[PDB]
Design a protein around this ligand. Structure first.
Ligand code: NI
Ligand code: NI
Ligand code: NI
Length: 160
């Protein structure tokens, strides 16, 4: 169980380093992944990026039992499948107490590596697509407030 960094912390602004291929399949990468699951799960989040716990790596996890498969994604690359955008409510453990509506691509392809270096290549839409965009934003130093285009839909969760 690891401390989730909060918006304002300069570490969330980094462009994360790729996971080195030497670390694929290692116990250390395993431990990091397990800590991330334990951390995400303890605070009840749908996703977590390694930078939010202060680890400078292109690694994210996400899962929701609109269900989304439990996934561990390294060194990702996202490709929008079209121009259709869709607004949805988002929150984030690094921005506690808030929700905001954010416009994302409705459908994406994502690629990357699983923790053993096996290739991942999925096309997905709706919520799954949103989660993946949201978590990969952490790897380029972006939190969702920086993606809001309608500020009337940004506020405290209990107020909204
Ligand atoms: Ni290398
Ligand atoms: Ni539990
Ligand atoms: Ni987040």
């Amino acid at each position: 169980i690891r401390e989730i960094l909060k918006m304002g912390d300069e570490r969330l602004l980094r462009i994360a380093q790729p996971v080195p291929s030497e670390l694929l399949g290692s116990e250390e990468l395993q431990r990091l992944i397990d800590d991330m699951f334990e951390t995400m799960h303890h605070v009840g989040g749908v996703g977590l990026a390694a930078p939010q716990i202060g680890v400078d790596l292109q690694l994210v996890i996400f899962g929701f039992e609109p269900a989304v498969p439990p996934t561990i994604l390294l060194n990702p690359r996202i490709t929008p499948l079209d121009d259709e955008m869709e607004e949805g409510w988002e929150g984030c453990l690094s921005v506690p107490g808030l929700r905001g509506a954010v416009s994302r691509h409705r459908r994406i392809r994502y690629q990357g590596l699983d923790p053993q270096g096996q290739p991942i290549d999925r096309s997905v839409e709706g919520f799954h697509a949103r989660v993946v965009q949201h978590e990969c934003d952490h790897l380029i130093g972006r939190l969702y407030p920086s993606r809001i285009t309608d500020f009337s839909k940004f506020g405290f969760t209990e107020v909204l």
